[PDB]
Amino acid sequence: KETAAAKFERQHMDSSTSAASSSNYCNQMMKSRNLTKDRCKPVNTFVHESLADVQAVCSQKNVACKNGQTNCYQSYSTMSITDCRETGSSKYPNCAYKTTQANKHIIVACEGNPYVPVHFDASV
């Protein structure tokens, strides 16, 4: 059993780097975080900020999640992120990813006690 909070950390947190170091980052990271197990995850965003700063977003700007729920939150500042996106030649089990580094606001859903991110909704 992986809780939503822990799954969020596995799938979306990379506090140990400040940005993607190479164009091969996503290939490495999608593999190591188990996002290429059973299927290639089509798109995935990793956040290069401390866990603490990502958790603080839960008490920042309240917005609607894409699915219409009200417990989503947008970070006040932009954050260092990496967008990983399947290329057109990616085909399980030989997944392949384009790496795009950016600085964007993140949007997460928060839930539980403590009130922590449980879902990556978007970047803007």
Binding site: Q28, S32, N67, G88, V118
Partner: protein
Amino acid sequence: MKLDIQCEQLSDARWTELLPLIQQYEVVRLDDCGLTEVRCKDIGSALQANASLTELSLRTNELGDGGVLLVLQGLQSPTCKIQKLSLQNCCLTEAGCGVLPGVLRSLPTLRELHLSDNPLGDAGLRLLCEGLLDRLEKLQLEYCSLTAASCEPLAAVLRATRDLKELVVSNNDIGEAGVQALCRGLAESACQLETLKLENCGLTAANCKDLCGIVASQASLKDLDLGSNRLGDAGLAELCPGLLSPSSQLRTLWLWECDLTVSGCRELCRVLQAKEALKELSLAGNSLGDEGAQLLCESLLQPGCQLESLWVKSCGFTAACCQHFSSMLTQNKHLLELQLSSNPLGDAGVHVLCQALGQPGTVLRVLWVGDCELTNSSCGGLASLLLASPSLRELDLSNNGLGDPGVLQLLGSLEQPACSLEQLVLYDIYWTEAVDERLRAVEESKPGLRIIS
């Protein structure tokens, strides 16, 4: 027999214990295990003694030039019968490629070589090619920092080889002149190539003229990947007469993000109606529009079209095209996979698709409708599809705005013993804690089923 460790940082004590297995196992793979030049001494010596080894993989480790040297020395041995060698993403630069010619000369057993994601550069490539100048079958050199200058040495290799079956030079800046030189080499070759990949290589419409000849002259060719090049309709139009050649029996054609419109699609439809060997096609990431979808659907209803997989993600399709797909889906008995992700089909569009696939006698096994602007309103239809479909085995709903009420609906059908879906894909779909435990239950209840996220 097989030692295989992935994404795992090994302690020194553990490394010492692994050494005898490297010394004698048939397959050794240590991928992304934090290996560096220090431990490469140990590896080379161990490989020196292994008379069983047929596959070595050391990808995603900072071996560097010195590390690769220590490893490759280990392979030159009258006992070494390595068939497969991978040093993908090992920080190998041109300065480390000096030993490649000698090493390739020592290993007549070597059949497959992967050196992708190393900055060999043109100078490194030249050295490698000195080795390849005359039984390698498969060569992969993606993201090797190559320019057009690398293509004359490769063209020479191609002219001489009789054994090469796979060439992958994707993600290199070889451009128009580079590809032209490659095609001349291949044109004058006796090799029977099965796989050719030139994805993101800077191809132009002009290269399609060179490729036209290759496709017709390589009767053995099965897989051609030209994705992510500025080919244009003018390019594809020059390529098609080659694809229509009776000698061409291509099985897989990748033309994603090739700057194609409806016009090029129209030329391509000629191939689809005439060539029964063609099983897999991607036209993803081209602006084809509803017009394009219509032409494709018409070809898929022609008897000569035996296509089994169509990838058309991000093609600018709307709900207006879905009736055509529905008609095709009720009549076509060959197409098993249809990828429609990242088209703004909406609830209305996917609804039309659901009715088609419900019908008895339909065959489609895999449907992608992720990132199609779907809402919880579509899950009535989707849940109904999960009970009704005779053929559906994998359904991808990823990257849609679904939540608790929609997923709860899908769960209703997935619980039923009548539902035989093998994979439901729900990446980046937010459902709450309450729903998750229900979801976990169904999962435990049905081992034949995977819910992926």
